[PDB]
Design a binder for these strands. Structure first.
Length: 248
DNA sequence: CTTAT
DNA sequence: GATAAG
């Protein structure tokens, strides 16, 4: 199967990703910014117990680490932990938004390429390391009143809710896939952050290109969802469109 | 929870 | 003077 042939490329079998060719990211602040420390609003026990196994897994994976930081933003329960990074986002220097909008992205899909593979990268932002100098920016408080730990944690990887994560990830993956594009000039590769479309002229070419793309992604440290993958189809769902008969 | 619309 | 999103 596709599963057995590419164990490193699939999130199901390859472990959590880590983009090994990408330098840890430094996040420049606006020229006047100073740290902001917002106290954690009390959380119900139900919410804390709901969030707790997620925090523990991320600690076990090294994606969260303890820290002491003059920055602090609140964690809210939604259970899944969601950090309110709005006050951090306000203090981080803006970057040019380079992620294309889906409409324009799909304009570069010619009618000659009607065999599609769609891949969805799992935990994409977490594949990109943060430089240690930038980690304290994203700190939050974590209380386990049972275990007694009160203290801060922060992220060692590009975090959810940070305003520049989609653009930084898209630019990083473009750098990492630049050689693949050169090695496969007859394939069409559309990147929308963690959502990838590979298009070829034939089933065979789509199979060989998909093999090459999975091998490349896994080698670089990214991980695709084997469950969601649409491999070598003439109809796929991509970015909310149904791609069928060259339409949409 | 807070906060921008 | 309910709403979606971090």
């Amino acid at each position: 199967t596709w599963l057995s042939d590419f164990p490193q490329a699939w999130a199901e079998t390859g472990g959590m990703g880590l983009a090994v060719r990408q330098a840890p990211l430094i996040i420049p602040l606006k020229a006047t910014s100073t740290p902001v420390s917002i106290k954690q609003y009390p959380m119900s026990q139900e919410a804390r117990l709901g969030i707790k196994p997620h925090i523990q897994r991320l600690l076990d994976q090294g994606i969260l680490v303890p820290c002491q930081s003059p920055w602090n933003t609140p964690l809210l329960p939604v259970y899944r932990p969601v950090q309110d990074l709005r006050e951090v986002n306000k203090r981080v220097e803006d970057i040019h938004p380079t992620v294309p909008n889906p409409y324009n992205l799909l304009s570069g899909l010619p009618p000659s390429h009607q065999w599609y593979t769609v891949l969805d990268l799992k935990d994409a932002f977490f594949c990109l390391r943060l430089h240690p100098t930038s980690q304290p920016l994203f700190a939050f408080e974590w209380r386990d009143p049972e275990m007694g730990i009160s203290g801060q944690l922060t992220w060692t990887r590009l975090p959810q809710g940070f305003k520049n994560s989609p653009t930084l990830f898209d630019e990083a993956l473009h750098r990492d896939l630049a050689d693949f594009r050169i090695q496969h000039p007859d394939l069409i590769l559309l990147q929308y952050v963690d959502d990838l479309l590979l298009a070829a002229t034939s089933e065979l070419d789509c199979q060989q290109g998909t093999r090459a793309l999975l091998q490349t992604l896994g080698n670089l440290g990214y991980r695709a969802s084997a469950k969601k993958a649409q491999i070598c189809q003439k109809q796929v769902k991509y970015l909310g469109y149904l791609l069928k008969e060259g339409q949409r």
